[PDB]
């Protein structure tokens, strides 16, 4: 007649590491490391991301002709660019404070494009029809949809003055451009005034531009340049444009409420109707575990990224059958 004290054993092959010993087989264990993802780009905070398709953010805002068929919502929790987003500023030049603008637009809650300076009534004495082969629509010369290239009507480019008052009850994003001919000849051919200037001002923003006439290497066949500028006009504020030449004028602008603390994801993963608390460029992941090895770059409330391939915690005891 005997009674024995003992402990559980089973067929479990689970192994864990301990400080004294590697590869110890235990009866039960749990994973602390989130090692999988769903291969989709999902909604953050119940809101879908902005998808730009062929276009990057610059192309979308300026209205690059390749961006015509994009469907933009009035809100997004973050922005998705793909390896297919090539269509930017098709007219060569510099986009000023571009990274900043991208950051500040990464999430918005009520976004609308509207016509700030209507094409039909705004410029009776200037030509609005200018295009370029550098910005092509189906193999034909075209231009940005949201801007208008103002050149001289007949022999002259009269001084223009235009103001917009922000009555939208939210911030208004206004973009414009300044054109820089390679030669004094082209300057007169386009704007007639050799002495031309552009001035833009608001309660905050104040800047003056003059044409920089210089020989340059050709980009997309052009020795000319076009620089792009923007500002966020506060509710109630006014923005005023003056030019004797070279202004690429606002046509459409954007009214919005900026969100905060989001960002841009670059991924070819398909966007879907799922919800997640943590988005990765590879796909969405569960946020319940404390650590994840899926990707160093995330957006959300996320497990901490670690280099570990394995973090496994013993719950049960040494399995010795």
């Amino acid at each position: 007649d005997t009674i024995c004290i003992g402990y559980h054993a089973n067929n479990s092959t689970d192994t864990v590491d301990t400080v004294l010993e590697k590869n110890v087989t235990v009866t039960h264990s749990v994973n602390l490391l989130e090692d999988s993802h769903n291969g989709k780009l999902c909604k953050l905070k119940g809101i879908a991301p902005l998808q730009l398709g062929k276009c990057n953010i610059a192309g979308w805002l300026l209205g690059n002709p390749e961006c015509d068929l994009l469907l933009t919502a009035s809100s997004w929790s973050y922005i998705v660019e793909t390896s297919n987003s090539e269509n930017g500023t098709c007219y060569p030049g510099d986009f000023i404070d571009y990274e900043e603008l991208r950051e500040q637009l990464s999430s918005v809650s009520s976004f609308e494009k509207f016509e700030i300076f209507p094409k039909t009534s705004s410029w009776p004495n200037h030509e609005t029809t200018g295009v370029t082969a550098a910005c092509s629509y189906a193999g034909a010369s075209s231009f940005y949809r949201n801007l208008l290239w103002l050149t001289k009507k007949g022999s002259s480019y009269p001084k223009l003055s235009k103001s917009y008052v922000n009555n939208k009850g939210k911030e208004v994003l206004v973009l414009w451009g300044v054109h820089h001919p390679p030669t004094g000849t082209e300057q007169q051919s386009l704007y007639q005034n050799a002495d031309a200037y552009v001035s833009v001002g608001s309660s905050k923003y104040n800047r003056r531009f003059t044409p920089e006439i210089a020989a340059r290497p050709k980009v997309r066949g052009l020795a000319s340049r076009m620089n792009y500028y923007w500002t966020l006009l506060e509710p109630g504020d006014t923005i005023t444009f003056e030019a004797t030449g070279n202004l690429i004028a606002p046509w459409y602008a954007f009214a919005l409420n900026r969100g905060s603390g989001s960002g841009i994801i670059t991924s070819d993963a398909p966007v879907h109707d799922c919800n997640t608390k943590c988005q990765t460029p590879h796909g969405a992941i569960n946020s319940s575990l404390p650590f994840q090895n899926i990707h160093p770059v995330t957006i959300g409330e996320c497990p901490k990224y670690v280099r570990s391939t394995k973090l496994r915690m013993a719950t049960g005891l040494r399995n010795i059958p």
């Binding site: 007649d1 005997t2 009674i3 024995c4 004290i5 003992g6 402990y7 559980h8 054993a9 089973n10 067929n11 864990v16 590491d17 301990t18 400080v19 004294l20 110890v24 235990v26 009866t27 749990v30 602390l32 973050y78 571009y98 990274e99 991208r102 950051e103 990464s106 603390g261 989001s262 960002g263 841009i264 994801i265 319940s288 575990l289 404390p290 650590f291 160093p296 770059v297 995330t298 957006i299 959300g300 409330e301 996320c302 497990p303 901490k304 990224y305 670690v306 280099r307 570990s308 973090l311 496994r312 915690m313 013993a314 719950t315 049960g316 005891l317 040494r318 399995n319 010795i320 059958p321």
Partner: protein
Amino acid sequence: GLFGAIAGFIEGGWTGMIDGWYGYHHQNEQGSGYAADQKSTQNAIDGITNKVNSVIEKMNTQFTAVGKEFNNLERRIENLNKKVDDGFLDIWTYNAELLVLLENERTLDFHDSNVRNLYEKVKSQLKNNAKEIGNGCFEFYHKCDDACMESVRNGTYDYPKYSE
């Protein structure tokens, strides 16, 4: 093992005992069989459950976009950003790796301690009414039926009742 029972003087585990982590195997005239000690198993379960949940739930974070973008005249702050990301990555990887190594050791020491404590609880109950074989088994100096085996498992075993 730190407490000397598991893979210790108790050399192996019981696949026969399916209903608990720690328990008893009895043999008498009525038969043999496995029975799990429910109190010590359930306490261990409660304990380990709290440990796992502590490691998981103490991690809380705020909504964050990790990525940042810099132009080719911003290289210095770009590398600052990289130093921050990499620094956080070095800290969390090192700490997480060691936390699991260290706490896994402690969890096994914990199971080992529970087994030892159970053994010595029975040992103190039986006293000289039984002989210690050494593999975690007690051989009774008297007849022990199912009710007797149960009193041992129940912690209610009656010592003066056996002078046999």
